[PDB]
Each structure stands twice: as C-alpha cells, then as structure tokens.
Amino acid sequence: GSGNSHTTPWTNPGLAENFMNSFMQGLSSMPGFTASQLDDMSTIAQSMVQSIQSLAAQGRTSPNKLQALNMAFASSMAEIAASEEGGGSLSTKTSSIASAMSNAFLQTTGVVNQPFINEITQLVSMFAQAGMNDVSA
C-alpha cells in the first residue's frame, strides 16, 4: 500500500496557502495575462487560502484534502484564462500558467513535482472548448 507520505506543496495548510500566493506573484509577471484577469483570479486565490485555514480551524486538514484544494485552485485558474484573456493568445496564456505554477513549487519546497505542470497545460487547452464560460451571453 502506497504510504510514507513525505513533504509536498499540500502536506500542510502553510505550504498549501503558500502555493496560490506565490503563484499569483509570478503570474502577475506573465505576458499572457492581463490586469483584468489578475484582479479576478486573485479573488479565488484568497478564497482558497481562507477555505484551507477554515478547515484547519475545524481540524479537518489532511494531505489529500489539501491536495484537492491544490488542483481545485489550479483548475479554477485555467478556465478564467482559457475563456477570456483579453490581451493574449491561446498558447501564451497556457504557457503563462504553467510557468507560474512551476515557480510556486520552488517557493514552497524548492522543487517541482513535475506531473502537476504537465496536466495544467491540458486544462487550459480544454476549458477553451468547454463553452460554459461563454454560454452565448
């Protein structure tokens, strides 16, 4: 049985919250993103950290639950960009998130897990066709 869980960007609330915080810091320096995006996406950033600490205050914090709130964030950063970047391109914004995600790993543990980044690129390129962002509004 897979066990002996070691340190990860989601092994504790501290590294978990540090992830999306440092992500936004790097993402704000990405050419594929705009001020309009950063304004909105940073709202989710503060939502996730406040949700994580609420779990901690409830004592419901676990590695897997923190992981689920790690990818949750990463996925909720993909459709924002995928739908409307305003001043970028399909490829550019996809690369921007990937690069920014990478940096967050170096800010937490100092190393990149790897599979994480590889799946994020797929998210951005799939949520574009999702269409539930456009909803013919």
Task: Answer left, alpha or beta for residue 22, where phi above 0 means left and psi between -120 and 50 means alpha.
Answer: alpha
- Binding residue for a copy of itself, selected from 4, 59, 110, 111, defined by CB under 8 A: 4
Q: Which position among 50, 86, 89, 106 is part of the footprint of a copy of itself (CB under 8 A)?
A: 50
User: Where are any strands of DSSP class E within the chain?
Assistant: none
Binding-site residue total for a copy of itself (CB under 8 A)? 50
Give the residue from 34, 45, 47, 35 showing the smallest Cα distance to 87.
Answer: 34
Q: At what angle do helices 63-75 and 13-27 cross, to 10 degrees?
A: 20
Interface residues toward a copy of itself, by CB under 8 A: 1-6, 8, 40-41, 43-44, 47-48, 50-51, 54-55, 60, 62, 64-65, 67-69, 71-73, 75-76, 79-80, 83, 113, 115-116, 118-119, 122-123, 126-127, 129-137
